[PDB]
Amino acid sequence: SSVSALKRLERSQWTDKMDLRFGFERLKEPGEKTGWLINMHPTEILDEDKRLGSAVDYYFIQDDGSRFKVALPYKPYFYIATRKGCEREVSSFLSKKFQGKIAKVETVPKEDLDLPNHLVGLKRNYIRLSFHTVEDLVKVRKEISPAVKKNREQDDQLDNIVDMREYDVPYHIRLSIDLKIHVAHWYNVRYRGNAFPVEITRRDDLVERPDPVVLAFAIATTKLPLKFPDAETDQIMMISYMIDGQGYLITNREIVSEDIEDFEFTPKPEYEGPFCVFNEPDEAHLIQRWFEHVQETKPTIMVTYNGDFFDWPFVEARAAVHGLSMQQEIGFQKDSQGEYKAPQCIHMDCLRWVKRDSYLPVGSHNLKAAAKAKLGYDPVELDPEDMCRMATEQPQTLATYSVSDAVATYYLYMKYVHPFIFALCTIIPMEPDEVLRKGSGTLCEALLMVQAFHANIIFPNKQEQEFNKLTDDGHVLDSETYVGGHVEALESGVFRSDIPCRFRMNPAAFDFLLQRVEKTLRHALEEEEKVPVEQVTNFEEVCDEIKSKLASLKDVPSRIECPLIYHLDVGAMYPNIILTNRLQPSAMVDEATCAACDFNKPGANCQRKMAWQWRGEFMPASRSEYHRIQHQLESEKFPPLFPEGPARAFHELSREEQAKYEKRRLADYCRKAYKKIHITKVEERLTTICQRENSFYVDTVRAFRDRRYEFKGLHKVWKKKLSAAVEVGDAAEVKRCKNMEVLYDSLQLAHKCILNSFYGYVMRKGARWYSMEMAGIVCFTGANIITQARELIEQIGRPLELDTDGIWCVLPNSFPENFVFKTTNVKKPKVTISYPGAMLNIMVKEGFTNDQYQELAEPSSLTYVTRSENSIFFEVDGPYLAMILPASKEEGKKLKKRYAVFNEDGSLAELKGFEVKRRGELQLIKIFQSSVFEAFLKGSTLEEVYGSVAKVADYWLDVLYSKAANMPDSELFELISENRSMSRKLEDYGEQKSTSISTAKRLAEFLGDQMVKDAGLSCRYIISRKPEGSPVTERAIPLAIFQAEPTVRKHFLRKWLKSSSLQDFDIRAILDWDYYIERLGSAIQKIITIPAALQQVKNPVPRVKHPDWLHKKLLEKNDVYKQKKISELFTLEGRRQVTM
Amino acid sequence: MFEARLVQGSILKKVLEALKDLINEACWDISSSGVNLQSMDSSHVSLVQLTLRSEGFDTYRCDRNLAMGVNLTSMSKILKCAGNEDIITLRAEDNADTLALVFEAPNQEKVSDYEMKLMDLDVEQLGIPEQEYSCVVKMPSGEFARICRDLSHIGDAVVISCAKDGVKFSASGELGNGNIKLSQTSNVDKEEEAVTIEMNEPVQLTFALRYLNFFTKATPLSSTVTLSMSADVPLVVEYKIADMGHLKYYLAPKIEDEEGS
Amino acid sequence: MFEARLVQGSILKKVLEALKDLINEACWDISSSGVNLQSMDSSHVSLVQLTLRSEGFDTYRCDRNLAMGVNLTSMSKILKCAGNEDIITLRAEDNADTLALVFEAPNQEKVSDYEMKLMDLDVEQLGIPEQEYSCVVKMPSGEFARICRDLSHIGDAVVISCAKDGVKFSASGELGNGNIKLSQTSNVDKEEEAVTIEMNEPVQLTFALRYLNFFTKATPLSSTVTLSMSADVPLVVEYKIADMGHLKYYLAPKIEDE
Amino acid sequence: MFEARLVQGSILKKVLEALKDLINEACWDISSSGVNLQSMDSSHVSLVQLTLRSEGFDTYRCDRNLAMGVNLTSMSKILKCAGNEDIITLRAEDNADTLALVFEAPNQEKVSDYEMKLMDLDVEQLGIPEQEYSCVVKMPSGEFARICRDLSHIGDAVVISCAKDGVKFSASGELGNGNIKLSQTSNVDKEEEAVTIEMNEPVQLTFALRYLNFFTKATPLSSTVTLSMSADVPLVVEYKIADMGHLKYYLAPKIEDEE
DNA sequence: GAATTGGTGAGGGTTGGGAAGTGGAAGG
DNA sequence: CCTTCCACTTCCCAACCCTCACCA
Ligand SMILES: Nc1ncnc2c1ncn2[C@H]1CC[C@@H](COP(=O)(O)OP(=O)(O)OP(=O)(O)O)O1
Ligand code: SF4
């Protein structure tokens, strides 16, 4: 035992010396100072008895560059529940049993959300156990936690222990939840001397932050041709980095053929990028120099891109080969999770932000693409195979590349990441390491824990997973789910405001709207704008022009007009619906728990009922057939855990194994006995939401929402400043205000992601507050609002696309559009309203808006106010210049979630779902789609529009029919490549056949498992012809062979094409040109021809036939011999209907 | 009750197997005088009528006139169980919930029985002009069946021309053209192996072959078919059973705009 | 070395395909007294028992107990190549991993020689215990095939009842119930046209009809089939190939909820 | 003008039924000598050759030798109309865009008359090579077809061996391997069971079973099939039509040297 | 230990049932 | 001795399951 304690002491000393070497002096002398809390860790310390106890080391920094540490002791604790009245006996038994293992035990009353009748004010006495160090907590919990199972299954003092809580929450996150210590704030610290706990307390007024010294670094290495590097054999060429605006480079003359010289790099005037250069004679000298320079500059923030994947496993190996222990010199060691972390500094990987927070597609998750998207300039490229020659022939260009990578890494960290991460850390207890690395669900669990502790509510334990539960009818459920977002694609083709388009309309709709114009506008002004209707001056004037334009519509519904393209969508929809109905994961109640509640009084308005659609799939097997399978498994035997071991009887296996064995064994029987393997059932259900239950979750969502609205409000204010400065032409003001615009927009997008996480969190496996119903009720309530908006807009006009948030539509040119209401109050002298907004919004006012909101008036009174609330409001984009939708190649189907929209400014506004955005889909499809969307803007008539659009596609068909005879010899190897990537290790897919697996095996046969060895393999291939009639997946050729050695290419291609008789092993012979022609044929059809024949124009492309079904229906339109019905020839004697 | 028996289920089998493919569900009208069916496509292009005289059954009773609705594919399942020589019995009761069927082997080695389930239906009823037709042709049923199948491969629609010289079927598609011609059989072994045309005046008509292909499914009910036509009005084609009565298919021709123009 | 020669070579084709769909693969057992198998389908509702006596073969040699894993799909594709008129020879070695088959045409023009790879199979096997089946029946095979095929359209499980008068099949389903009765016929011209029933006490039980459409594939083995019933005991179907062997299917009843 | 008349539909039907798998669109050539066609298959693996002499028709008018482009699947879907007994006549004018086809019931009770669009086709072709052969084998067609199908079940390709005593086939693959011999017949009673071999030198050669299993589709065309074989030169498989004509396929051997 | 959700498109391979054609056996 | 019906095998199209990445 003692040796382990001494090893923990040894590592604690090692870390204390490591950070002391980096300048973090511990506070030794009694006194008082101020500082900004940048980091912390938990560590043990020795008390006045020299007993080891657990503590947290806070790290502080100051504006003068001084730094220090403070250690604060805090006893870990958790709760146990005891049967009625046992708590004194249980605590006495535990305290004698575990004397010296436990620190203190005590009884505490806590409220618990699951307690019956709890809103009376009831609470129950949990017992806290607290320990001198977490190792005794871990031991005592491993003693206790098996013993409580029997109490659960049935229903010594240990029998009285019923349950235990919070025994798995992190220790350090306790302290920052409990004592409100939070990161990125200025604190006083007062140390009385060792006899007393330190005092730490925030000071709010020092709003400005200090500037911690930041380093970012990257490396370049040798590698084998055509293959991945290996850290044993390859060697670093150069390491490039930046500290606080100063750049540096180190280069190794063992490999780099010439000395580099210092230079400066600035793509945009903001990125000053001065780079210093040092030339070092050998790899060991390079590494030692870098280590010394880091130990000199002693950064607190250390920055990499993907650096846990490539850079650290490389530099650690190259250091250790020369005996330089990076772990001892720097401090970095690979954690158990495989992530390099350090005691003295914070480690931040930008990719783990880009992946989680950017809202970019995987197509742009590469550093170069994320830089291009966010920073607004093109980085420089080197071909990964040529760096071996570049380091020999042109060292300066390799240095320039590595510097460009350093500059991009640093400035991308600085602009987006630095504000956001610490801003979020102001409200999450966690370190900047966890808050960046942790999953977006755990963050939200922490934000909820903060409030739940402040409410003094004991947490529930994590939800425990279930396997093969039964439907009530007994069918074994494979899957349960709720029906999600609702999507429709009502129309097809093109729309433009520039061209005449036909409408038909219902006059009763106009009469209904005209009859309510004032009642709509009053609500639109007072509730949404918050300008009282008494303060507006000319309210009566505009109402008459509205009424008269509605009358002008009412008199003539059917018409030709220009269309107004409008998008009409709900803001912050699912948060707002949660707030409006006041949904909470705890608040769903059955009838029996309401019957247990003293507020269950006849006529009490507390119960709200809402409906949702459940979906579940069950296997067809009977309950009794499943019991038969189980009865047969009463004697089955199974293989050992390991080849040496004896075989295991079925009763020895884990539940996780047994459930999977049952599921397979029953699925086979089902395949035999009941031909449909799975039955899918949809069912509507209703669930009651309590309205008086504690609001902590919903108030959390309210606060987070209002924070995101803070960022959007500043975004709107600076948008005002920007638009003024742009109209005036104030370049310095435009530059500053545009920087503020970017900063607040990216912040509000990140908050959008985290805020939305609050909804889906409720479904996460294991979540503490878990419930499926609150995830369905929101989806269904979001499907209603959009469906009713489709009803209304379909009466006035023609909706064109739906999704979960809002409608895309065309409206007739005569519609009221926009108005300005003038005001006496100079604070808001002009209020602008769009009528389509209030037109939709009033239906949400009338139907949806909540009329059962309740709030506690006085905790001692047990009395509540009743209130009404709505926050669901439509808002309006555009109007837009043009819209295009594709249509399905199959009859009766329409392509959802694929479309393109253009701003009145005349440039691409949105382009959603098409292959251009997808990662690595066939490049030719990308280039064709890109060109045709821009081509749709040309022309002025549908005959012109489709006649021009056809000319873009026809050129690419002419390319394919010409076998690209004019295309440069290298270009096909890119243009024709698929780049389909593969997630898992090639072992794990088993037998399943697909072209990715096929070509990964085809490479493994060429270069061995050194490529296969690890997850995330990438593939590039073409599909060949010559093994005729072989199924498609068996003609795949990876591009690699066209760069392999000729005598090996003419071996592997001879094998794979089953032919030496192929006289020329040339891609142009090898390509399956007709397959690529069919691929493009489909890509042209879905956009340029089927969406033509639906718009009553002819087929605009000769080369591509319609599908024969459409050819038949279109030709049947076009002949004189009309098919009569028999009802036109024979007299109808009557209608008759038959009853059984 | 209703109750009937039939000498050979082959007739009723070929009936159901000719109805099932065209009309999905239909209702029978039932009486002491027999059984009748009239029903129309959900396409409303074409129409079907069947008459089964009581005197054709082996034994027949009905207590009171009734009607009942049946899904024809569901019934047509069960009759697949009846053997070619089996003797079949049908029953129903005035509560009209179910149709009982029983099959007996000729040697009474075996009994098979089933309880088919009725359904509720709506229909619109069409009067028949009962005119005489300006042309009638009577023809070997299999030869008309093959004429239909062959031309259905040539194109989507047939043109029918009837003249004193004979009858011609024609069609075309993007492949080209096809013609089939018949003329009066001068020397007749028996009328069941002869084509005969009778006319008032010549006629020309056009029809969509997809329906004719479903009409020809009745071929195994008789050696010969009759077709009756008059200008600008529905074509009627008929198969008849010597015992039971008749099955008639009615189709409305296509017509030109120039009439309306 | 095991070797044997069978003059009525079609039997191997028939008896193999009567299992091709029911069991994928099995370890065929060979001894001086014949070629044998017991096996179970992976659904574990049913057991298969097969034996061909060496006395029936035109030639037979066996010098040790031999076991050989075969996937029946492969031999099924091989036995597609033999005509029903051909004479079959089978050969195996205790020191090799391949089975050899030779086909000989009665005209002596045509011969064939197929080699297929054995596979490495072992299975833990119980002998089916002796049973006093309280009721036993013999029927012409095509009649039982038609009964099960026709009832399969009405539904997926059949209730069979036996009584002093004979047997009844009955079924229920969404399209409505139905029944078939076979009484004990009085007199018959030949056994291939005859039904025979013995019943010690009345029994009725429910059987999963979707399985019997597998067993009925044995029909070309025999003009007649033997069946047996008892309470809470797998029903027997038995085919016998002249006097030279047997194939039997044992199938459990559906365990009712009550 | 061109026309010709024939009492049999069966030959013209089953020729189309044999071609439809190998060739989609073809140019026929037409002469006083009859109808001829040679054409590479769509995969260019093998070459079809066919002719029907004019002596085989009931009557034949051809004022000038000519060539005509036609679509095989369409002509098949027309010829499926004729009954096997029906009298066939084919005709075209010297400048028609169309081929006209007439089918009559033997009793003349019925007439049927169809038209197909011509198309403009030309194809680049060699004068077909022929030689004396190392081996020639005569077999009943149905047995050769069945053997080829059974070998295709076991594997991808068949290797053939010829010798004085008999003809042997072998194949190998993931199922194992299979070997077959047909003996020379001891005394031919009539050719409809006769296997006979001409043997200048023993030969062994390998071919892909897919294309043989397409060539076999002509099996209804004649009860006897003939194989013509030598090393380092195409196999030819030949069927003969009445006396009037012949159908042949040319295929190269799957080179074993690659192994 | 650590872990937000459901709906959709595109591509490629596998599985079931119905329709067509041929050969064998029974009926007259 | 010839024609029709039953049974078996082959061929063709629709539906269902696997992956990955985007739209919310
Ligand atoms: N990451 C996510 N996780 C779960 N559901 C999500 C989601 N993103 C969207 N949804 C679902 C639920 C919400 C819905 C999309 O609406 P928003 O509230 O995201 O608002 P929007 O219009 O995108 O932006 P705003 O107007 O607030 O600025 O889709
Ligand atoms: S909804 Fe009303 S009755 Fe039900 S638990 Fe809540 S307060 Fe009690």
PDB file of N, CA, C and O (backbone and C1' of nucleotides) in Angstrom, chain A residues 899 912-913 917-919 983 989, chain F residues 17-24:
ATOM      1  N   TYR A 899     -32.342  21.560 -53.597  1.00  0.00           N
ATOM      2  CA  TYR A 899     -32.872  22.726 -54.308  1.00  0.00           C
ATOM      3  C   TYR A 899     -31.846  23.850 -54.329  1.00  0.00           C
ATOM      4  O   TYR A 899     -30.793  23.766 -53.695  1.00  0.00           O
ATOM      5  N   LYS A 912     -28.616  23.571 -51.795  1.00  0.00           N
ATOM      6  CA  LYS A 912     -28.765  22.627 -50.698  1.00  0.00           C
ATOM      7  C   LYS A 912     -28.916  21.210 -51.234  1.00  0.00           C
ATOM      8  O   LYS A 912     -29.740  20.955 -52.127  1.00  0.00           O
ATOM      9  N   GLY A 913     -28.153  20.297 -50.622  1.00  0.00           N
ATOM     10  CA  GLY A 913     -28.231  18.863 -50.810  1.00  0.00           C
ATOM     11  C   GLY A 913     -27.576  18.293 -52.051  1.00  0.00           C
ATOM     12  O   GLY A 913     -27.370  17.074 -52.109  1.00  0.00           O
ATOM     13  N   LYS A 917     -21.948  19.592 -52.855  1.00  0.00           N
ATOM     14  CA  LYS A 917     -21.570  19.731 -51.452  1.00  0.00           C
ATOM     15  C   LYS A 917     -21.085  18.418 -50.850  1.00  0.00           C
ATOM     16  O   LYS A 917     -20.293  18.437 -49.903  1.00  0.00           O
ATOM     17  N   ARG A 918     -21.543  17.281 -51.365  1.00  0.00           N
ATOM     18  CA  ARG A 918     -21.185  16.005 -50.760  1.00  0.00           C
ATOM     19  C   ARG A 918     -19.684  15.770 -50.893  1.00  0.00           C
ATOM     20  O   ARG A 918     -19.042  16.229 -51.842  1.00  0.00           O
ATOM     21  N   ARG A 919     -19.124  15.051 -49.924  1.00  0.00           N
ATOM     22  CA  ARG A 919     -17.703  14.710 -49.928  1.00  0.00           C
ATOM     23  C   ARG A 919     -17.404  13.596 -50.926  1.00  0.00           C
ATOM     24  O   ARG A 919     -17.835  12.452 -50.747  1.00  0.00           O
ATOM     25  N   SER A 983     -15.151   4.188 -43.171  1.00  0.00           N
ATOM     26  CA  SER A 983     -15.051   4.554 -41.762  1.00  0.00           C
ATOM     27  C   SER A 983     -14.259   3.536 -40.945  1.00  0.00           C
ATOM     28  O   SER A 983     -13.316   3.902 -40.234  1.00  0.00           O
ATOM     29  N   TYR A 989     -16.321  -5.081 -41.404  1.00  0.00           N
ATOM     30  CA  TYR A 989     -17.492  -5.241 -42.258  1.00  0.00           C
ATOM     31  C   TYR A 989     -17.844  -6.697 -42.531  1.00  0.00           C
ATOM     32  O   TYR A 989     -18.929  -6.961 -43.061  1.00  0.00           O
TER      33      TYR A 989
ATOM     34  P    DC F  17     -35.796  -4.638 -44.923  1.00  0.00           P
ATOM     35  O5'  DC F  17     -34.208  -4.674 -45.039  1.00  0.00           O
ATOM     36  C5'  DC F  17     -33.513  -5.908 -44.975  1.00  0.00           C
ATOM     37  C4'  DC F  17     -32.064  -5.702 -45.360  1.00  0.00           C
ATOM     38  C3'  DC F  17     -31.379  -4.652 -44.493  1.00  0.00           C
ATOM     39  O3'  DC F  17     -30.196  -5.169 -43.905  1.00  0.00           O
ATOM     40  C1'  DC F  17     -31.077  -4.161 -46.813  1.00  0.00           C
ATOM     41  P    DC F  18     -29.468  -4.315 -42.760  1.00  0.00           P
ATOM     42  O5'  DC F  18     -28.199  -3.647 -43.460  1.00  0.00           O
ATOM     43  C5'  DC F  18     -26.987  -4.370 -43.603  1.00  0.00           C
ATOM     44  C4'  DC F  18     -26.005  -3.594 -44.460  1.00  0.00           C
ATOM     45  C3'  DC F  18     -25.668  -2.214 -43.936  1.00  0.00           C
ATOM     46  O3'  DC F  18     -24.596  -2.293 -43.023  1.00  0.00           O
ATOM     47  C1'  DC F  18     -26.044  -2.177 -46.316  1.00  0.00           C
ATOM     48  P    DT F  19     -24.179  -1.018 -42.147  1.00  0.00           P
ATOM     49  O5'  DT F  19     -23.495  -0.026 -43.194  1.00  0.00           O
ATOM     50  C5'  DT F  19     -22.254  -0.363 -43.784  1.00  0.00           C
ATOM     51  C4'  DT F  19     -21.900   0.620 -44.879  1.00  0.00           C
ATOM     52  C3'  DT F  19     -21.652   2.035 -44.404  1.00  0.00           C
ATOM     53  O3'  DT F  19     -20.287   2.194 -44.114  1.00  0.00           O
ATOM     54  C1'  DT F  19     -23.020   2.007 -46.394  1.00  0.00           C
ATOM     55  P    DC F  20     -19.770   3.418 -43.223  1.00  0.00           P
ATOM     56  O5'  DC F  20     -20.054   4.690 -44.137  1.00  0.00           O
ATOM     57  C5'  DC F  20     -19.297   4.916 -45.307  1.00  0.00           C
ATOM     58  C4'  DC F  20     -19.799   6.156 -46.009  1.00  0.00           C
ATOM     59  C3'  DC F  20     -19.639   7.417 -45.171  1.00  0.00           C
ATOM     60  O3'  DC F  20     -18.991   8.413 -45.915  1.00  0.00           O
ATOM     61  C1'  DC F  20     -21.868   7.241 -45.957  1.00  0.00           C
ATOM     62  P    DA F  21     -18.599   9.791 -45.209  1.00  0.00           P
ATOM     63  O5'  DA F  21     -19.806  10.756 -45.565  1.00  0.00           O
ATOM     64  C5'  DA F  21     -20.060  11.132 -46.902  1.00  0.00           C
ATOM     65  C4'  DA F  21     -21.203  12.106 -46.922  1.00  0.00           C
ATOM     66  C3'  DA F  21     -20.994  13.284 -45.976  1.00  0.00           C
ATOM     67  O3'  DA F  21     -21.240  14.451 -46.718  1.00  0.00           O
ATOM     68  C1'  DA F  21     -23.081  12.301 -45.583  1.00  0.00           C
ATOM     69  P    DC F  22     -21.368  15.905 -46.064  1.00  0.00           P
ATOM     70  O5'  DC F  22     -22.934  16.170 -46.091  1.00  0.00           O
ATOM     71  C5'  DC F  22     -23.567  16.209 -47.362  1.00  0.00           C
ATOM     72  C4'  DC F  22     -25.030  16.540 -47.244  1.00  0.00           C
ATOM     73  C3'  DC F  22     -25.263  17.865 -46.531  1.00  0.00           C
ATOM     74  O3'  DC F  22     -26.102  18.672 -47.354  1.00  0.00           O
ATOM     75  C1'  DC F  22     -26.536  16.170 -45.498  1.00  0.00           C
ATOM     76  P    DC F  23     -26.835  19.991 -46.815  1.00  0.00           P
ATOM     77  O5'  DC F  23     -28.171  19.415 -46.167  1.00  0.00           O
ATOM     78  C5'  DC F  23     -29.276  19.107 -46.997  1.00  0.00           C
ATOM     79  C4'  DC F  23     -30.549  19.084 -46.191  1.00  0.00           C
ATOM     80  C3'  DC F  23     -30.829  20.354 -45.401  1.00  0.00           C
ATOM     81  O3'  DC F  23     -32.176  20.741 -45.607  1.00  0.00           O
ATOM     82  C1'  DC F  23     -30.833  18.476 -43.947  1.00  0.00           C
ATOM     83  P    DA F  24     -32.681  22.180 -45.306  1.00  0.00           P
ATOM     84  O5'  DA F  24     -33.599  22.328 -43.980  1.00  0.00           O
ATOM     85  C5'  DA F  24     -32.999  22.546 -42.686  1.00  0.00           C
ATOM     86  C4'  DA F  24     -33.704  21.707 -41.665  1.00  0.00           C
ATOM     87  C3'  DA F  24     -33.628  22.208 -40.247  1.00  0.00           C
ATOM     88  C1'  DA F  24     -33.336  19.812 -40.339  1.00  0.00           C
TER      89       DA F  24
END
